[PDB]
Design a protein around this ligand. Structure first.
Ligand SMILES: Nc1ncnc2c1ncn2[C@@H]1O[C@H](COP(=O)(O)OP(=O)(O)O)[C@@H](O)[C@H]1O
Ligand SMILES: Nc1ncnc2c1ncn2[C@@H]1O[C@H](COP(=O)(O)OP(=O)(O)O)[C@@H](O)[C@H]1O
Ligand SMILES: Nc1ncnc2c1ncn2[C@@H]1O[C@H](COP(=O)(O)OP(=O)(O)O)[C@@H](O)[C@H]1O
Ligand SMILES: [Mg+2]
Ligand SMILES: [Mg+2]
Ligand SMILES: [Mg+2]
Lengths: 7, 375, 375, 375
């Protein structure tokens, strides 16, 4: 979750 | 080849692979961390024309490729493409076998631990390295300074750090991470170039805009008077010849691009800025650390070769820090490479050779060994 | 005439002028944004035969004219021809004096600012409007929805938008712009009609192909099974009588034309598609915005009257968005006009009458006033 | 005969059959793509006098025949007459059996796919070739150059191309097609010869005018000063002895004939010209392709043996392209044959022998196999 890249 | 067991220092931040050997001045291989791939059909029969172009060759052919960065905000997103990047790193550029050399990888703090863990699994399972070690990138950026006390800002292509260290001891509660870095500045510059009249939308045109950002941008010590300075006359305009023809002429975009780094509201990102995350990392440290962080404020990765960012940096941290403090922004012109250079120092230390995560200890403890030996 | 000072709402996207008054249901004047011009000599003496035909008259005479759109991808290229278009707009079609009425122009986000600035200079200097205001076109497309929260796709003749708005606040970092729209679909349809056997190359024949696209195209909810459905039998073939004689019969070209909108590789354009630029505009917004963008996904300009594009749109955004999210594609059948209709709402608001860029403020601050009063 | 299974390279553009074997310098058979037919009655009894004359024999008897080209603008119109042309090609001129040889046909881009499909059906069903392959004609014109990067103009008798290719990859969205070529120039020359005083109206007289165009025409680097040069003195007049007697003397018609190629308004055809369709094909390519298209602008089919058309070509593309670009018009004097020569290269490649559309794959997948194996 988050990001793009993060989950 | 290499007649010894010299350690490899591979440093992919998020946008530029810089790899080489330990005990070495500069990285031997510096190339873009891209993997390109043809987006329309091959017509000349008998050509070669492999269906993957990694590294500098991809920028040689970027007019017919869709360029794709396998590592975004310091997090590896494509794992098979990062294996293309590592395979090209060891076997084509650095031109060596990974089975013979311990390797030193780098990543950022506050990263997903599956990045570090899968990076260890790919180093031992796929490339069969004898030893391996992940390293916090700003820490190594302080190894290149020759200092054991200082707070480190580096700001690579996907992440910026502010790791404070005092007398050899890091302060991991006072650590920082902002996901605003040079690829975000490239995208914002590409947006305001669309504001002036020049439309860049392709990944290859994104690489052109990144080149405009590198050649032709500075940081504007006082942003309001520089802004009105560009609004007054055309003495700040500067032309850039695009590949294959048309020239462009940029004005206030020359310094509005890294002002986003000092003011992240431009890219719509709720943060405090670079200058306030340094000061907040210092204020999270103890009271008896802070003047030794003020006088040792190392500013040493990529996206810091904007002219005047140490002047803006000292000029703004001085406004935050109390008076009668000595604010020294260390900006050593060998940065963009000093994370690698401190990797070369750390891997060439003699105390360090029992800190490698070795195989038969990877095989004993699985891939989670990195969370007891690395940090 | 008009016994009041009602504001003009002129809306030239890139391919169709729709103009009228504020406080009004539909635009009073809808005509093609073309200027035609004779390409061979006049022989009947005593004829009139003016050497410029603007608007609908140009399509009445397009067999002897070279039609030319003065506005391409939302950017005005010919300025004297756009002045022909505006002159015909106010004085012939809408049949009114611009000196008596504030005017509301529209353009796209991420446009060159000399388009907006020269449009303001032409409105005050040439037509002598008392007040003037440029407006972001998808924002107005949300004014017609009666919503203050939603992400707006419109896709006119030269540009598509995806402007996200939450609780009245736009997210200009999460804004989008793709230069794939209906004139590009007209050109691609003209190419694949050349693949079937029908050669259309003239600008008038381009206008015929545009008519074939409007009458006789849908979007194909599942493109592969629709493609094999057309390959199996001739139940998808449909005939179109060309002007002056010969009939044509089109098959898979009926739905390969707007699949380019969902898959821009067909026209050789490196992009993500309409459905992924919506999802990427939503993911660029904050975490607490997204379900209110999922349930309010307004799809409201031209080139969206393809049958089933809301079904393809929901069917593909649902595949991108997480489950337990409510994807509502708002496709209000009054679109192709809702940018004008929301222009009529905004210009008829009472809070808005101090947001007009007025003359004596244009004369005070030059033509750059648009970058402090408009947005 | 032929003791091997050498591939046939048959190349009918629209007006001249040039056929031969693969792995060969020049085409073995070059003859006009006409089929003649007697238009009045046979009176000498015991004569032979077959009621169809194909190829060069038709120009030997064109005074008593109505000559008819079975292929118009690169599209085969008469199929039985094209079967006469192919039958004469294999069995009379090239004097070989098609059952023993794979054949390489050529056509233009953006053609009706029933041309390609029916050409495959006639090659397998009628002539029983073992393998067959249609090929894009300008692509093969780049195979003869020894280049894998360049934009190709060829301009045969019925069609002109501009296919751009970069590093072996064609850019099919940037492809072009104009239906202005040498038969149209022959008709326009025949019209302006009627303007001077010489009436040519028969198909045989059309063949005489085509001969006048080949012998006695150049392209006029600067058309206005060449036009006034012919208007000043008679130093540009040149005489041509017609068959059987009367001599003619042509002036400005010597260079007004291929100026139609650079300026299609003369034949009443709404287009941009040859020099602007090249530049528009280059500008449709990506930014990082264009200087490698500027320096590799191959100009290699028929109707390019006008003297000075490379000088006019470079002189006009330089005026369109930006400065500090290197415009190299490649005009290799073996053109008019280089589509065949590149056909000979491609059919003699060893990588290519699994790209033939073979029989038992034609029989398996019908005649639509050409749209998955050819391009
Ligand atoms: N001279 C320069 N001026 C401004 N920015 C630069 C310069 N050189 C590199 N950059 C930017 O720095 C980033 C790369 O920094 P670096 O730390 O080497 O990246 P990585 O994170 O891959 O190690 C790129 O985004 C590049 O655009
Ligand atoms: N019923 C329809 N189906 C498909 N496309 C349409 C239809 N009506 C209009 N279009 C296309 O929409 C475009 C015009 O939409 P509009 O939003 O009015 O354009 P503008 O950008 O000029 O406002 C034209 O390209 C036209 O071909
Ligand atoms: N020396 C020449 N100068 C000018 N035009 C020529 C010359 N030779 C041939 N042509 C023209 O070129 C055309 C044939 O070109 P080519 O490409 O060989 O035809 P095809 O398209 O049938 O292959 C004919 O129209 C002929 O008039
Ligand atoms: Mg780095
Ligand atoms: Mg619109
Ligand atoms: Mg030819």
């Amino acid at each position: 979750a988050x990001x793009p890249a993060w989950x | 080849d290499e007649d010894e067991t010299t350690a490899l220092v591979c440093d992919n931040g998020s946008g530029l692979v810089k790899a080489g050997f330990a005990g070495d001045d500069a990285p031997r291989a510096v190339f873009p961390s891209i993997v390109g791939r043809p987006r329309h059909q091959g017509v000349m029969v008998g050509m070669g024309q492999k269906d993957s172009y990694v590294g500098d060759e991809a920028q040689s052919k970027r007019g017919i490729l869709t360029l794709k960065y396998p590592i975004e905000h310091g997090i590896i997103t494509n794992w098979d493409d990062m294996e293309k990047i590592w395979h090209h790193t060891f076997y084509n550029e650095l031109r060596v076998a990974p089975e013979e050399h311990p390797t030193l990888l780098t990543e950022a703090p506050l990263n997903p631990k599956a990045n570090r863990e899968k990076m260890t699994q790919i180093m031992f399972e796929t490339f069969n390295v004898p030893a391996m070690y992940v390293a916090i990138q700003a820490v190594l950026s302080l190894y290149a300074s020759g200092r054991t006390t200082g707070i480190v800002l580096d700001s690579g292509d996907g992440v910026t750090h502010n790791v404070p260290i005092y007398e050899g001891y890091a302060l991991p509660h006072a650590i920082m991470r902002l996901d605003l870095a040079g690829r975000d500045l490239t995208d914002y510059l590409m947006k305001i170039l669309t504001e002036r009249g020049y439309s860049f939308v392709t990944t290859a045109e994104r690489e052109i805009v990144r080149d405009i950002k590198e050649k032709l941008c500075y940081v504007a010590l006082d942003f309001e008077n520089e802004m009105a300075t560009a609004a007054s006359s055309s003495s700040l305009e500067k032309s850039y010849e695009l590949p294959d023809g048309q020239v462009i002429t940029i004005g206030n975009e020359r310094f509005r691009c890294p002002e986003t780094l000092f003011q992240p509201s431009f890219i719509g990102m709720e943060s405090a800025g670079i200058h306030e995350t340094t000061y907040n990392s210092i204020m999270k440290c103890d009271i008896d650390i802070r003047k030794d962080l003020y006088a040792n404020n190392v500013m040493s990765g990529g996206t810091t070769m904007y002219p005047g960012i140490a002047d803006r940096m000292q000029k703004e941290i001085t406004a935050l820090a109390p008076s009668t403090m000595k604010i020294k922004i260390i900006a050593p012109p060998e940065r963009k490479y000093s994370v690698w250079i401190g990797g070369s120092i750390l891997a060439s230390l003699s105390t360090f050779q029992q800190m490698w995560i070795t195989k038969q200890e990877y095989d004993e403890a699985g891939p989670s060994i990195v969370h007891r030996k690395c940090f």
